[PDB]
Design a binder for this molecule. Structure first.
Ligand SMILES: Nc1ncnc2c1ncn2[C@@H]1O[C@H](COP(=O)(O)OP(=O)(O)OP(=O)(O)O)[C@@H](O)[C@H]1O
Ligand SMILES: Nc1ncnc2c1ncn2[C@@H]1O[C@H](COP(=O)(O)OP(=O)(O)O)[C@@H](O)[C@H]1O
Ligand SMILES: [Mg+2]
Ligand SMILES: [Mg+2]
Lengths: 187, 501, 466
């Protein structure tokens, strides 16, 4: 066999085996951005009631579900290596798991420029000066030249503090400083 | 549901264009290896039970065809194989070299020499997975196959085409019956009557390698390696090489049977084959049964011992005799394997481990040894005398100062000591019929029991010399007439007057 | 409809069709072989795919071979023209005498007779053997078992029942060999020629033979007992005659279903058999019945593996029999042939109405003196004979002659010992067990009762050892 390039995330499952085998063929020949723009439009053209039907319907055949898809991917835009991918998903019966392969590929291609975003879950949204200060100290923490994305969630069960995660780091300044008052009891 | 060939090394061949410089019709790769079988991807024109060849030089059998892969049973060790190899398709069912030009060699189970005498020089190849002959071509046995042992040839007679078991515990004299059968054929293979010639095959399964080597000397010492083949898969060989050892051994005997010759094969032993088929079955995750055996152990030994048959006169007239060996654990003749083979073969021979300790050798249990179809095919000279000894060995067995008890307890011990025999001394047929004559006609009833092994070695050594031309009419005419037994009365009663007590 | 072979795993071939899915139990024909490979549809797996079971060796099958649907189940030639011939599993002549020429063809998988067709007649089939006349008598038109280990006499006995019952019969006979020695099947064909039962010049033959032996694949031993059954349904239904049906051995039908049940993808039940073990034996065994048109008298021969009568294969066939003859080896070691267990042999017609009030009373006195002897063997073995009573030195001294009087020299075993084969009538095996249970013969040794016919030869033997 030949060797294959390793993705920087390395997820597992029956959907990770198809997002890795495409990443080992599109990192070769330098086509990692052409497939991504194609894959974000094949997600749109599957979820139509003419086409979402008779792909999960088990009583058609294997071969005529290929021919109804071998011309659909040929006429509109595509003749890359990715036309073999839809041809291979329909042979193995794995055409149902096609949103699983696409959604895995975006995060596998995200990490080529992405940052595994944060989670600040404290309270109601605050003023602008508090937001820009955390966005300009977390930029000092990545040290990788990548413009970090972030999400904010509202959870009032934390009393007055906030929890912050950077990837897989998870600092903590929250109501667990009230649970640290067992030193008055357990001593 | 994850698929064997859903791995990324095979999806990449498909997702990067359907590649042209891979064959995928006569050659394939190896995906995994280590439990015996290998998972070969490709090879889309392979047959079932077709021998393939690895890149290391190992043969392998195509056992199990699937829509993704092929499962190849590997002959020999599986250290030499690596994931990512390339396996070639031979194009033929598993077959072995066979012919007249093998008499005198020591091969392994695949048909390669391991005696260091160069190639074999064969021209024909027969398969190992052929079927037995049907109901029409067979016929009942009629020619006798001599053994040279005084306990076997007169109490459980064998015939050319009859299966016969040899069953006993360890170190009871199992192999030493099978060796004296091969040395006894020296008198027939070196003669002019071609209709009585008989070849031999020995199959050694799971034995030690240093016990086969001390066996081929003993055959060469007695001029018995010029009509004998030996197949050998010893205890250090892999498990598929012990499973396919009796099939390649029987396919070399099927050549002589279909071409008018008579053969003989000794499997030694079929116990260690069934513990090798157990290993390949449980390593394929099959449901075990009694004693953790697979469900088709009966198919293993029936499809092998059904080939040993005798063809009719319109098919050539040859034969094939088998003599398998089963080892029991402490006299257990009610276990799973020694009952699957009693319900196949046409009789038994029992070797007791508690008569081998008392000094009776060969320790043949005369009560439990039977031979059904081979009783009608024996010499009328032997049937005229051994039909009487069958009666007195029965009357000795019920009585185990009274009247009608101390008469049979006297004769019944002189016939037990008459049936002892030294190692590697195969007697002829017409020399047996004089020694069994003196023990059943009532001549040695007066002697002491300890001085009767001395008596047989003195009477035979002289009548072979001074009455040699008068003994040949027993073997030539094949019977004891009214002139021979009146002549035989004077030979013994003149020798007892000269035999110093 | 044509299909492509997709997977070959042992003796189970997978086939994918493209149109026209054939229903279950249909036969298929493989294209491109020298001989005739015929399959048998067993499951539907979805995605237009069946799973078959092959009736011959599957050596040499390429993934992509073409297979042709026959459109119907396996049909064999049936009629009176199949008498005196030999047939294999799929009904081809294997006796090199030409093709079997009949007019109609019958499928293998037929359904059972209904509830309103069962006849309730009971009679007695007198054989001539002292043990099975007295303690477990045989009924005409009912099933008969023969249990035993490996080497006790399940075939020396079944070739004696052919010699006594089937030779003097007026009807037809069918032998079906399922998994036995092929040299034994040659001897049966070559003894019926000399005795005139099968004739090769004219059309007065009386027995057909069906054979699938031990060298056959597992798919061909699991379906040959249905073939020797379908031959004997024409001679009952469409002719109205009294047939005989000897099957030997019927355990190989059960064993060869477990060899193929692992390859079909099932969870296995107890000691290693298939899960559907008692569902498909009752489907086979409820086609051998005496209905309102004719009488099938089946004499089966069942194998007990490792001498264990609690194994699920010889312990689910006990609910399908009328008589029962359990052979044992521990009686056969002492030299008592046939080695029939007296206290384990049962019968259904043993009832004081049908066999009488005199047959029923002597037959229950024999099972009483042989059970009390069985409860003293734990004491005689330790404390010897001199520790019993005086009245209990008479139960022992009488049961040791009834045991030896249940021995008989058979007719087919003349070439074993050289003794003459003896036959007794039913009225004289009642008189022999009255003059022993009463005490008329308390002046004879036990060995004078050994291997004789009726009671008159016992006193003609004790004068020799005088
Ligand atoms: N007729 C005989 N007289 C004296 N000794 C004998 C005789 N036959 C065999 N023996 C002795 O028995 C020994 C073992 O015999 P043999 O090799 O046949 O046993 P075995 O059952 O083959 O052993 P295993 O099966 O465990 O290898 C031999 O060394 C031999 O000396
Ligand atoms: N009536 C009898 N007299 C002498 N020997 C017998 C008798 N019945 C059975 N036997 C012995 O029991 C054995 C039974 O073997 P057989 O009937 O051929 O096969 P199975 O193992 O199926 O019983 C035979 O070897 C035979 O020697
Ligand atoms: Mg040995
Ligand atoms: Mg039998």
């Amino acid at each position: 066999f030949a060797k294959l390039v390793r993705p920087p995330v390395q997820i597992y499952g029956i959907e990770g085996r198809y997002a890795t085998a495409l990443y080992s063929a599109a990192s070769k020949q330098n086509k990692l951005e052409q497939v991504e723009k194609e894959l974000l439009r094949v997600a749109q053209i599957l979820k139509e009631p003419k086409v979402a039907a008779s792909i999960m319907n088990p009583y058609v055949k294997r071969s005529v579900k290929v021919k109804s898809l071998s011309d659909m991917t040929a006429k509109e835009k595509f003749s890359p290596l990715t036309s073999n991918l839809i041809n291979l998903l329909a042979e193995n019966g794995r055409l149902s798991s096609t949103p699983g392969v696409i959604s895995a590929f975006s995060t596998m291609m995200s990490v080529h420029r992405g940052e595994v975003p944060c989670s600040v879950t404290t309270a109601s949204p605050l003023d602008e000066a508090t937001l820009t200060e955390l966005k300009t100290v977390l930029k000092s923490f990545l040290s990788k030249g990548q413009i970090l994305k972030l999400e904010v969630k509202v959870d009032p069960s934390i009393m007055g503090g906030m929890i912050v995660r950077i990837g897989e780091k998870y600092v903590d300044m929250s109501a667990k400083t009230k649970i640290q008052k067992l030193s008055r009891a357990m001593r | 549901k994850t698929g064997t060939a859903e791995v990324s090394s095979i999806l990449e061949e498909r997702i990067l264009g359907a590649d042209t410089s891979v064959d995928l019709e006569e050659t394939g790769r190896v995906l995994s290896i280590g439990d015996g079988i290998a998972r070969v991807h490709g090879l889309r024109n392979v047959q079932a039970e077709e021998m393939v060849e690895f890149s290391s030089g190992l043969k392998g059998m195509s056992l199990n065809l699937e829509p993704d892969n092929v499962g190849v049973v590997v002959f020999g060790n599986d250290k030499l194989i690596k994931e990512g190899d390339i396996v070639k398709r031979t194009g033929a069912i598993v077959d072995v070299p066979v012919g007249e030009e093998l008499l005198g060699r020591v091969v392994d189970a695949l048909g390669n020499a391991i005696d260091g005498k160069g190639p074999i020089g064969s021209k024909t190849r027969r398969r190992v997975g052929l079927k037995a002959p049907g109901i029409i071509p067979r016929i009942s046995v009629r020619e006798p196959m001599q053994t040279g042992i005084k306990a076997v040839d007169s109490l459980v007679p064998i015939g050319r085409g009859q299966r016969e078991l040899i069953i006993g515990d360890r170190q009871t004299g199992k192999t030493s019956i099978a060796i004296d059968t091969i040395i006894n054929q020296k008198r027939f293979n070196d003669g002019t009557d071609e209709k009585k010639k008989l070849y031999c095959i020995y199959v050694a399964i799971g034995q030690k390698r240093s016990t086969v080597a001390q066996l081929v000397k003993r055959l060469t010492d007695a001029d018995a390696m010029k009509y004998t083949i030996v197949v050998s898969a010893t205890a250090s060989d892999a498990a598929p090489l012990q499973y396919l050892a009796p099939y390649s051994g029987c396919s070399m005997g099927e050549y002589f049977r279909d071409n008018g010759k008579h053969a003989l094969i000794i499997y030694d032993d079929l116990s260690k084959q069934a513990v090798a088929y157990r290993q390949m079955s449980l390593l394929l995750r099959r449901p075990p049964g009694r004693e953790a055996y697979p469900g088709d152990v009966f198919y293993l030994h029936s499809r092998l011992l059904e080939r040993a048959a005798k063809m009719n006169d319109a098919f050539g007239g040859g034969s094939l005799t088998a003599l398998p060996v089963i080892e029991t654990q402490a006299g257990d003749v009610s276990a799973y394997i020694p009952t699957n083979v009693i319900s196949i073969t046409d009789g038994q021979i029992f070797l007791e481990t508690e008569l081998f300790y008392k000094g009776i050798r060969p320790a043949i249990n005369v009560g439990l040894s039977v031979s059904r179809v081979g009783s009608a095919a024996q010499t009328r000279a032997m049937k005229q005398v051994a039909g009487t000894m069958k009666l007195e060995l029965a009357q000795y067995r019920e009585v185990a100062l009274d009247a009608a008890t101390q008469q049979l307890l006297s004769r019944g011990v002189r016939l037990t000591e008459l049936l002892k025999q030294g190692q590697y001394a195969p007697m002829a047929i017409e020399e047996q019929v004089a020694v069994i004559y003196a023990g059943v006609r009532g001549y040695l009833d007066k002697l002491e029991p300890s001085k009767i092994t001395k008596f047989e070695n003195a009477f035979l050594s002289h009548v072979i010399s001074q009455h040699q031309a008068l003994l040949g009419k027993i073997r030539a005419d094949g019977k004891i007439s009214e002139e021979t037994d009146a002549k035989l009365k004077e030979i013994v009663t003149n020798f007892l007057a000269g035999f110093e007590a | 409809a044509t299909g492509r072979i997709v997977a070959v795993i042992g003796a189970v071939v997978d086939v994918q069709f493209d149109e026209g899915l054939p229903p279950i139990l249909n036969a298929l024909e493989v294209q491109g072989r020298e001989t005739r490979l015929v399959l048998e549809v067993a499951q539907h797996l979805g995605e237009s795919t069946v799973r078959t079971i092959a009736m011959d060796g599957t050596e040499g099958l390429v993934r992509g071979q073409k297979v042709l649907d026959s459109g119907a189940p396996i049909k064999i030639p049936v009629g009176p023209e199949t008498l005196g011939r030999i047939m294999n599993v799929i009904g081809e002549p294997i006796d090199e005498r030409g093709p079997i020429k009949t007019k109609q063809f019958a499928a293998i998988h037929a359904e059972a007779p209904e509830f309103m067709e069962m006849s309730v007649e009971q009679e007695i089939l007198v054989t001539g053997i002292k043990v099975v006349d007295l303690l477990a008598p045989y009924a005409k038109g009912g099933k008969i078992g023969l249990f035993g280990g490996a080497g006790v006499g399940k075939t020396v006995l079944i070739m004696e029942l052919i010699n006594n019952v089937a030779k003097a019969h007026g009807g037809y006979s069918v032998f079906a060999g399922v998994g036995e020695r092929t040299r034994e099947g040659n001897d049966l064909y070559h003894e019926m020629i000399e005795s005139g039962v099968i004739n090769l010049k004219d059309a007065t033959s009386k027995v057909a033979l069906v054979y699938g032996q031990m060298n056959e694949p597992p798919g061909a031993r699991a379906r040959v007992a249905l073939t020797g059954l379908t031959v004997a349904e024409y001679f009952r239904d469409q002719e109205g005659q009294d047939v005989l049906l000897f099957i030997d051995n019927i355990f190989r039908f059960t064993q060869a279903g477990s060899e193929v049940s692992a390859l079909l993808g099932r969870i296995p039940s107890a000691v290693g058999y298939q899960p559907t073990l008692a569902t498909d034996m009752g489907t086979m065994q409820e086609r051998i019945t005496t209905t309102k048109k004719g009488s099938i008298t089946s004499v089966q021969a069942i194998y007990v593996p490792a001498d264990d009568l609690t194994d699920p294969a010889p312990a689910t066939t006990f609910a399908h029999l009328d008589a029962t003859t359990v052979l044992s080896r521990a009686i056969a070691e002492l030299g008592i042939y046939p080695a029939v267990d007296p206290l384990d042999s049962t019968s259904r017609i043993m009832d004081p109405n049908i066999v009488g009030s005199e047959h029923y009373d002597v037959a229950r006195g024999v099972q009483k003196i042989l059970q009390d002897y069985k409860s003293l063997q734990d004491i005689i073995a330790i404390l010897g004979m001199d520790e019993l009573s005086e009245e209990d030195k008479l139960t022992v001294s009488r049961a040791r002659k009834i045991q030896r009087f249940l021995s008989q020299p058979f007719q087919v075993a003349e070439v074993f010992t050289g003794h003459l084969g003896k036959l007794v009538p039913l009225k004289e095996t009642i008189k022999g067990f009255q003059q022993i249970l009463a005490g008329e013969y308390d002046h004879l040794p036990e060995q004078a009762f050994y291997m004789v016919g009726p009671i008159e030869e016992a006193v003609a033997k004790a004068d020799k050892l005088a």
